[PDB]
Amino acid sequence: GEFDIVQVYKKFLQDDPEITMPVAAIEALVQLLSRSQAKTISEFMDILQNGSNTLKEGVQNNISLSAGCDIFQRFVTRSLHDVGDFEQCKRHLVENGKLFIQRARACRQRIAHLGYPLIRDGSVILTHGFSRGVAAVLLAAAKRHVRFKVFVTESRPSGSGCLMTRTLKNACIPTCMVLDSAVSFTMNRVDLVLVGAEGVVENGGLINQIGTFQLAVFAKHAHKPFYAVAESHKFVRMFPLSQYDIPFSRPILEFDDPSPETVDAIHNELIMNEEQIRNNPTLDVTPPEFVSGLITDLGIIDSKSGVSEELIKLYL
Amino acid sequence: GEFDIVQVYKKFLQDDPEITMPVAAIEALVQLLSRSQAKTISEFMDILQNGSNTLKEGVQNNISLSAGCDIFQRFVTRSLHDVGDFEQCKRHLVENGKLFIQRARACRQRIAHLGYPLIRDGSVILTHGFSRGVAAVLLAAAKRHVRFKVFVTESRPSGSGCLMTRTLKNACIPTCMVLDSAVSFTMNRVDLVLVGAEGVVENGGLINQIGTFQLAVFAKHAHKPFYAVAESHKFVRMFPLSQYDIPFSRPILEFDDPSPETVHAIHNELIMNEEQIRNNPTLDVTPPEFVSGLITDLGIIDSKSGVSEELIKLYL
């Protein structure tokens, strides 16, 4: 009995940082599953949820795993039956677990040798902040020896842009970091925009970092296409109503109440404070009419109605 | 004699910082014209030409500056005549020159008397960073006791949002800073969008700090109105074709050359350095199709053809 699976989850991040957070969760559940010794089907699903939720609430109720955790459950729940030997249950169960992990680990690869030809000779690409998805495909393209250049949004408040350029610069790729306020000015140059994904919705929506829809309309207005890479285990069952209807933990964009009683053209270091920042949101949502093609291990999906057929296929 | 007239211009900033830059240059030109023992018409215009350019070349080749100075001349020489008394020239010049600056610095007030009713009770306004005119109208509105509350774009790289924030909060009105990456998520909550002007071109376009166009597209797509406050002496003869072709000093948005070597969620300290920040532009341009209303000392102009007719009426 581990009784602290989060550590195994955590330990995975140090045994390998090159894996996504949900991947560790599943890789941890199997360790729970394999070691768990039960006697009823209900016993498994009881601690499984009570393990997933235990794993959920530990990580600020992150969405990426919250999908993967729920999808994984509803996966093994499918072709589950108990005939004669009870041990057959666990057998069919955990064996499919590794089988799911197999596809899960190979998912972020399957998109690479599938989205790399989207880059053409001498083309110029744009990316909002770092994402493990857009990275490999570019590298799996640059590996093929193809000339191209790339801008990267600085991606406040994450600042993941400063890391993304390095990962590309290190891989022999020309970069040019650009402020979040100057993406529109860049659309004239760019031939194709490309971002990762943090969550795909029932309507084909796109929950990713805070500024995706900021540039999604630009490419829509600047007539350049829009592409986003999303692994299967990022489909979610929610369904918003706009670019705003999302549940968010901390309340956002509150105002202050000012009682009548109180007190170089580039002015660096004159910004908001950390307290001012966290009032601002963290995630974004681009309605499907603004994306022209999802990039998944299941392939490239453009209808953003078939995503539901695929989403229905993913769940029961 | 009259030399380093920039210090006159400069001492004005210490004599008064609440006035902008172009008014100071004008205040210096008339001062230059005042102590100008001249004898021929050619001498006068030869001075201010070889005077304004020295004034022009001294400050970034700023637009609002280069706007007023060039406009100042082509005003004074308009109704110019020489008859008998040569002193009439210097008389007619400074007398009319005084009338200009008199009308000039009074413009920023005249705008407030027009913009304040544009704010409704309980309205929600949006402004991209600091903007002289935007402040006064809101203040002159708040003086008249009206409930509302505004967001503020932090305005990278200028960071002028915090300055705009305080100056509003300092005048007891609610504020809430917004990083430039997440303006779109806030639009559904707004009822009006109001930004300043750093320069106005012929076609009705807008030259303001970078990210100004970043907003107007949202206001367009989010079906929210867009107003910009501009003083007359900011009009310019420039006519950019697209939303990009504008004269810019330094090279902008260049890339690197990664030869084969090897050099090596509120992450608040991995930010683009001053060098790579410089590679970003400081100005964007809002096409006239997005300006629902343009408010000036001459009034409010929505035609964006009368922008030009009033413009032609300025350049004699």
XYZ file of C-alpha atoms in Angstrom, chain A residues 67 71 100 103-104 107 230-236 295-298 314:
18
model
C -9.313 14.448 -18.725
C -10.811 8.887 -19.802
C -3.339 2.524 -22.948
C -0.647 4.639 -27.005
C -0.408 7.524 -24.540
C 0.726 9.762 -28.851
C -3.781 18.111 -29.217
C -3.291 14.614 -27.868
C -6.307 12.329 -27.547
C -6.243 12.340 -23.736
C -6.916 16.095 -23.829
C -10.527 15.818 -24.975
C -12.842 17.016 -22.220
C -3.594 17.500 -34.771
C -4.142 14.312 -32.781
C -2.791 10.802 -32.523
C -6.150 9.936 -34.074
C -13.447 8.062 -26.507
